[PDB]
Amino acid sequence: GWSTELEKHREELKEFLKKEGITNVEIRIDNGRLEVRVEGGTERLKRFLEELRQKLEKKGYTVDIKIE
């Protein structure tokens, strides 16, 4: 139940979060869907997530991002 492609993007997202010192983001991968939930974030996080969603939706992945 492991997605080679989504795991690559998970690693890139985690590396960005680590560089930024952001520790309040939850990530789930489920049957080809990427889910990201976070309570608020900076413009830097928001732009990264917008770009990630656009790149993956273009490939047909479902990307559910919620910034609460």
Going from N- to C-terminal start, the domains of the chain cover 1-68
Q: Where are the alpha helices (DSSP H) in the chain?
A: 4-20, 43-58
As a whole number of angstroms, the distance between CA 34 and CA 59 comes to: 13
As a whole number of angstroms, the distance between CA 30 and CA 26 comes to: 13
Tokens in use for 12?
Answer: 């890139």
Strand ranges of the sheet holding 33-38, from the earlier edge strand across to the other edge: 25-30, 33-38, 62-67
Degrees (nearest 5) of the Cα angle 45, 38, 22?
50
DSSP annotation of 68? -
Closest CA relative to residue 28, chosen from 50, 43, 49, 7: 7
Resolution in A: 1.2
Please, which experimental method was used?
A: X-ray
- Residue found under tokens 């690693």: 11
As a whole number of angstroms, the distance between CA 4 and CA 15 comes to: 17
As a whole number of angstroms, the distance between CA 63 and CA 11 comes to: 16
As a whole number of angstroms, the distance between CA 31 and CA 9 comes to: 15
The amino acid at residue 22 is I
